[PDB]
Amino acid sequence: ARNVLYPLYQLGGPQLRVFRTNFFIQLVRPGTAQPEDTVQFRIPMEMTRVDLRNYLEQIYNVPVAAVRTRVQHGSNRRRDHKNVRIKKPDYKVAYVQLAHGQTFTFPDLFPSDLRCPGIPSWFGL
Amino acid sequence: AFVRLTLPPPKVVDRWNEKRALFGVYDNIGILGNFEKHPKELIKGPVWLRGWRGNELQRCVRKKKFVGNRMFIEDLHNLNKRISYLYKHFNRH
Amino acid sequence: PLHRYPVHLWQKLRLRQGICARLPAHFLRSLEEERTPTPVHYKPHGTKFKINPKNGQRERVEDVPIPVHYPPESQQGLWGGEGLILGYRYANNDKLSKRVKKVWKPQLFTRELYSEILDKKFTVTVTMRTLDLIDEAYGFDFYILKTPKEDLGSKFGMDLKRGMLLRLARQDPHLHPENPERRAAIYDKYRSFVIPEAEAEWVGLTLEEALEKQRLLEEKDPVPLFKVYVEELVQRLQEQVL
Amino acid sequence: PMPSPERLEKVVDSMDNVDKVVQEREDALRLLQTGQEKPRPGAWRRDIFGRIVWHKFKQWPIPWYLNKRYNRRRFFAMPYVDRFIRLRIEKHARIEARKRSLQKKKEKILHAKF
Amino acid sequence: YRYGMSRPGSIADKRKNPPWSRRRPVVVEPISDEDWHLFCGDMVEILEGKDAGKQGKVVQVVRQRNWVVLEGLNTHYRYIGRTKDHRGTMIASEAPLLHHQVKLVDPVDRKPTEIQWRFTEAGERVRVSTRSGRIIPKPEFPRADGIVPETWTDGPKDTSVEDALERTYVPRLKTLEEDVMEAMGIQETRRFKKVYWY
RNA sequence: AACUAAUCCUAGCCCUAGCCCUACAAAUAUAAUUAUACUAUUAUAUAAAUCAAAACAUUUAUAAAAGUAUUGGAGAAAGAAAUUCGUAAGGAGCUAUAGAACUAGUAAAGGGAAAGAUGAAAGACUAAUUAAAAGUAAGAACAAGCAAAG
RNA sequence: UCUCCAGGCAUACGCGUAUAACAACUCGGAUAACCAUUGUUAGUUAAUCAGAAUAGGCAAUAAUCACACUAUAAAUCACCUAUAACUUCUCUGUUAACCCAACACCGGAAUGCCUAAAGGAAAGAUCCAAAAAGAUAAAAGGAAAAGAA
RNA sequence: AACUGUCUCUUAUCUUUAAUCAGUGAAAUUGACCUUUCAGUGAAGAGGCUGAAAUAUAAUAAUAAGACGAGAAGACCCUAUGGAGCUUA
Task: Measure CB to CB from residue A8 to each of D22, D40, D59 and give the nearest one.
Answer: D59
DSSP element (H, E) containing D83? helix D81-113
Check whether residue A31 has its CB closer than 7 Å to nucleic acid strand G: yes
Residue D74: Cβ within 10 Å count: 10
Candidates C74, C68, C79, C78; CA nearest to C42 is C68
Q: Which residues contact A97 (CB under 8 A, 6 or more apart)?
A: A35, A37, A38, A39, A64, A65, A66, A67, A68
The answer to whether the beta carbons of residues C164 and C172 sit under 8 Å apart is no
Q: Which residues of D touch C228 (CB under 8 A)?
A: 35
Classify the phi-psi angles of E108: left when phi > 0, otherwise alpha if psi is within -120 to 50, otherwise beta: alpha
- D45, with CB counted inside 10 A (0-12, 13-18, 19+), is middle
Residue of D nearest to C7 (CA): D86
φ and ψ of C239, to 5 deg = -65, -40
Distances (CA, A) of B49 to B38, B41, B68, E7: 16, 12, 14, 55
Q: Which residues contact A8 (CB under 8 A, 6 or more apart)?
A: D59, D61, E192, E195
Contact D61 A10 (CB under 8 A): yes
Query: What is the β-pairing status of strands D59-60 and E196-197?
Result: antiparallel
The residues with which C104 forms a beta bridge, in sequence order, are C85
Torsion sign, CA atoms C138, C143, C145, C147: positive
Residue from D80, D82, D90, D92 whose CB has the most chain B CBs within 10 Å, to mutate: D90
Report the alpha-carbon distance of residue D62 to residue B88 in Å, rounded: 67
Report the alpha-carbon distance of residue B49 to residue B69 in Å, rounded: 17
Contact A15 E19 (CB under 8 A): no
The answer to whether the beta carbons of residues A67 and A97 sit under 8 Å apart is yes
Report the alpha-carbon distance of residue C181 to residue C175 in Å, rounded: 11
The answer to whether the beta carbons of residues E46 and E53 sit under 8 Å apart is yes
Length B6 CA → H31 C1' (Å): 39
Interface residue D23 vs chain C (CB under 8 A)? no
Q: Which residues contact C212 (CB under 8 A, 6 or more apart)?
A: none
Contact E192 A13 (CB under 8 A): yes
Report the alpha-carbon distance of residue C76 to residue C83 in Å, rounded: 13
Nearest-Cα distance to chain C for B72, in Å, is 7
φ and ψ of A82, to 5 deg = -85, 5
Distances (CA, A) of A59 to A21, A40, C177, C201, E81: 10, 17, 75, 65, 52
Residue of B nearest to D89 (CA): B72
Check whether residue A48 has its CB closer than 7 Å to nucleic acid strand G: yes
Contact C6 B70 (CB under 8 A): yes
CA angle E49, E54, E59 (to 5 degrees): 85
Report the alpha-carbon distance of residue C127 to residue C77 in Å, rounded: 9
The residues with which E136 forms a beta bridge, in sequence order, are E127
Query: What is the β-pairing status of strands C120-126 and C109-115?
Result: antiparallel
Nearest-Cα distance to chain A for D110, in Å, is 32
Torsion sign, CA atoms D113, E3, E6, E10: positive
Q: Which residues of A touch D22 (CB under 8 A)?
A: 20
Eight-class DSSP state of C76: T
The CA R_g of chain A, rounded to the nearest whole Å, is 27
Report the alpha-carbon distance of residue D17 to residue E164 in Å, rounded: 14
The answer to whether the beta carbons of residues C6 and B70 sit under 8 Å apart is yes
Q: Chain G bases under 7 Å from protein CB?
A: 16-19, 39-40, 42-46, 86, 89-95
Q: Which residues contact A92 (CB under 8 A, 6 or more apart)?
A: A42, A43, A44, A45, A47, A69, A70, A71, A72
Query: What is the β-pairing status of strands E102-104 and E55-62?
Result: unpaired
> What is the residue-wise DSSP string for D25-64?
HHHHHHHHHH--SSSS-EEEEE-TTS-EEEEEP-EESS-T
Torsion sign, CA atoms B8, B12, B17, B21: positive
Report the alpha-carbon distance of residue C74 to residue C80 in Å, rounded: 9
Report the alpha-carbon distance of residue C7 to residue C5 in Å, rounded: 7
Residue from B66, B67, B69 whose CB has the most chain C CBs within 10 Å, to mutate: B69
Check whether residue A93 has its CB closer than 7 Å to nucleic acid strand G: yes
Q: 3-class SS at C111? A: strand
Strands (E), C39-108: 49-51, 58-60, 85-90, 99-104
Contact B69 C4 (CB under 8 A): no
Length C24 CA → H2 C1' (Å): 119
Check whether residue A45 has its CB closer than 7 Å to nucleic acid strand G: yes
Q: Which residues contact E26 (CB under 8 A, 6 or more apart)?
A: D113, E2, E65
Nearest-Cα distance to chain D for A92, in Å, is 22
Residue C82: Cβ within 10 Å count: 21
Length E67 CA → F121 C1' (Å): 11
Contact E195 D63 (CB under 8 A): no
Check whether residue E87 has its CB closer than 7 Å to nucleic acid strand F: no
Residue C160: Cβ within 10 Å count: 25
φ and ψ of C234, to 5 deg = -65, -45
Eight-class DSSP state of B49: G
Q: Which residues contact E143 (CB under 8 A, 6 or more apart)?
A: E149
End-to-end CA distance of chain B, in Å? 40
> What is the residue-wise DSSP string for B7-43?
PPPP----TTSHHHHTTTTTTTHHHHTTTSS-GGGG-
3-state helix/strand/coil string of chain E: CCCCCCCCCCHHHHHHCCCCCCCCCCCCCCCCCCCCCCCCCCEEEECCCCCCCCEEEEEEEEHHHCEEEECCCCEEEEEECCCCCCCCEEEEEECCEEHHHEEEECCCCCCECCEEEECCCCCCCEEEECCCCCEECCCCCCCCCCCCCCCCCCCCCCCCHHHHHCCCCCCCCCCHHHHHHHHHCCCCCCCCCCCEEC
Residue D5: Cβ within 10 Å count: 9
Eight-class DSSP state of C37: P
- E122, with CB counted inside 10 A (0-12, 13-18, 19+), is exposed
Query: What is the β-pairing status of strands C49-51 and C58-60?
Result: antiparallel
Candidates E70, E66, E36; CA nearest to E52 is E70
Distances (CA, A) of E174 to A18, D22, E180: 18, 11, 10
Do C and A touch, 3+ Cβ pairs within 8 Å? The answer is no
Greatest Cα pair distance, chain E, in angstroms, is 82
Candidates E35, E100, E29; CA nearest to D107 is E29
On the CB side of B32, CA atoms within 13 Å amount to: 6
Check whether residue B78 has its CB closer than 7 Å to nucleic acid strand F: no
Nearest-Cα distance to chain D for A111, in Å, is 13
Report the alpha-carbon distance of residue C169 to residue C156 in Å, rounded: 19
The answer to whether the beta carbons of residues A20 and E177 sit under 8 Å apart is no
Distances (CA, A) of C142 to C153, C157, C163, C191, E71: 15, 12, 13, 11, 99
Check whether residue D111 has its CB closer than 7 Å to nucleic acid strand F: no
The CA R_g of chain B, rounded to the nearest whole Å, is 22
- C190, with CB counted inside 10 A (0-12, 13-18, 19+), is buried
Check whether residue A71 has its CB closer than 7 Å to nucleic acid strand G: yes
Nearest-Cα distance to chain C for D44, in Å, is 13
Contact D34 C224 (CB under 8 A): yes
CA angle A86, A90, A94 (to 5 degrees): 160
Contact E198 D110 (CB under 8 A): no
CA angle C196, C199, C201 (to 5 degrees): 110
Q: Resolution of the coordinates in A?
A: 7.3
Nearest-Cα distance to chain C for D23, in Å, is 17
The answer to whether the beta carbons of residues A52 and A32 sit under 8 Å apart is no
Contact D62 E196 (CB under 8 A): yes
Check whether residue D84 has its CB closer than 7 Å to nucleic acid strand F: no
